[PDB]
Amino acid sequence: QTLPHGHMQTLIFLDLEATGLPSSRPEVTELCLLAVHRCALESPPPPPTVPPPPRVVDKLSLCVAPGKACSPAASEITGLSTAVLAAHGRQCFDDNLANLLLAFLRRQPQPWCLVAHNGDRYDFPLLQAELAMLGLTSALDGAFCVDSITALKALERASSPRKSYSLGSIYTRLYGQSPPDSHTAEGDVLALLSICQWRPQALLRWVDAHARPFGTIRPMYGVTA
Amino acid sequence: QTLPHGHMQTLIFLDLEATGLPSSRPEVTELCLLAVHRCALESPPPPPTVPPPPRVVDKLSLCVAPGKACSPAASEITGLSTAVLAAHGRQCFDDNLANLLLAFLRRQPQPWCLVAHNGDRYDFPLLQAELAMLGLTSALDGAFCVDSITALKALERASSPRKSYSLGSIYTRLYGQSPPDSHTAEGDVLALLSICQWRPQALLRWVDAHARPFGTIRPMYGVTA
């Protein structure tokens, strides 16, 4: 099927930062969602330069207090530590946060498609795990999702030694400069948006064909329901 | 009283963009909230350069479909028009949006203080008016608010022909460069944050003394309750 779930109407670019690797039972420290209606990517289009983001976007960036320490590597990479987060009064991943995320999604036309780089192995199962610990094991079931590593592999294969498909590797290969020297969830989402604007119509075709119901993502840890 | 309502814990920088001037019964087209815990401004500190934003911030930026046309001047300034907003599937100012705003505020330690440039004459009464049309005439009553025009007038008077206190005028006077060439609610909030970081401890003293309960803001139009 070219449209198993119809055309995705809104792409919600997502990044989660957390306390450590999956084997550590990590907890979210920061999240960013950037919602872009598909029409911002419905465009007919020398080495390219970074495109500007669409004018009409919705953005949500939040810091979150985990119930455990960040690993030294995580704090090095993200600039967040549990003491830093506590000094700023950050709250845990709770029911109010889940309601905020859903209310943000409800501002967007459906179908919704979350887009995250390495989402299938990290961001999506982690988000499912945090919701599972709250017993909100179906809260995001209305959403679809795709992993942009898989997408960009497909787009680059159709477009043309093995390449890396890390976010930074793709961005620098496409645009000849490194993504803005930022270490935030928002920075990662903005860089992902830029890579998704490289071949935007081809991206939308791939997304429509591969969109996966979020309820089929198994949680990284915690209960399934 | 130096602390009529205690120390404000979180400053939520706010900008609203809308369809026209107050005399036109305007409706919101875009909003941005940027929440910064006060500790990011509790710092002892040649011509200065623009300071970087704090690492730990929460951000929400949303576009909104008004129930009427934008004025030509408004669309010129903001890049938004009702057709553009409709093409991106934007939703009106509704109950879900009000709930989203409140859930965002509930991520922040209280007391909350909204900070908006010209807020007393524009952003605060307009936000009250939109909530009033939904019958949510006390939804934000827990918040306090201050107008940064009044604040910066006070700070510059203590620090040193008449000056303009428009956002751009203050920013260029303090930092010797114009605020990033952006025409978005988020851009205005980021520029306001930068000006509030000029004399941050003095700003916090002024804010604590002048914080005003949001429920005392009369709506620009609509019912009072």
Numbering used by the authors:
A (entry chain A), B (entry chain A): 4 to 48, 53 to 167, 173 to 237
Copy text verbatim from the article accompanying this structure deposition:
TREX1 is a cytosolic DNA nuclease essential for regulation of cGAS-STING immune signaling. Human TREX1 is a 3′-to-5′ exonuclease composed of an N-terminal DNase catalytic domain (amino acids 1–242) and an unstructured C-terminus (amino acids 243–314) implicated in membrane targeting. Loss of TREX1 function results in accumulation of cytosolic DNA, inappropriate activation of cGAS-STING signaling, and severe autoimmunity. The overall structure of hTREX1 adopts the homodimeric conformation previously defined for mTREX1 with enzymatic active sites on opposite outer faces of the dimer.
Reasoning that reduced thermal stability and poor crystal packing may explain the lack of structural information for hTREX1, we screened each hTREX1 chimera for the ability for form protein crystals. We identified conditions for the growth of hTREX1 Chi 2, Chi 3.1, Chi 4.1, and Chi 5.1 crystals and determined three crystal structures (hTREX1 Chi 3.1, Chi 4.1, and Chi 5.1). A 1.25 Å structure of human TREX1 establishes a complete model of solvation of the exonuclease active site and a 2.2 Å structure of the human TREX1–DNA complex enables identification of specific substitutions involved in DNA recognition. Solvation of an enzyme active site is a critical parameter for protein-small molecule interactions. Notably, the high-resolution of the hTREX1 Chi 4.1 structure reveals the human catalytic active site in exceptional detail, including 18 well-defined waters in the core of the enzymatic pocket providing a template for structure-guided drug discovery. High-resolution structures of hTREX1 and hyper-crystallizable hTREX1 variants now provide key insight and tools to facilitate the development of TREX1 therapeutics.
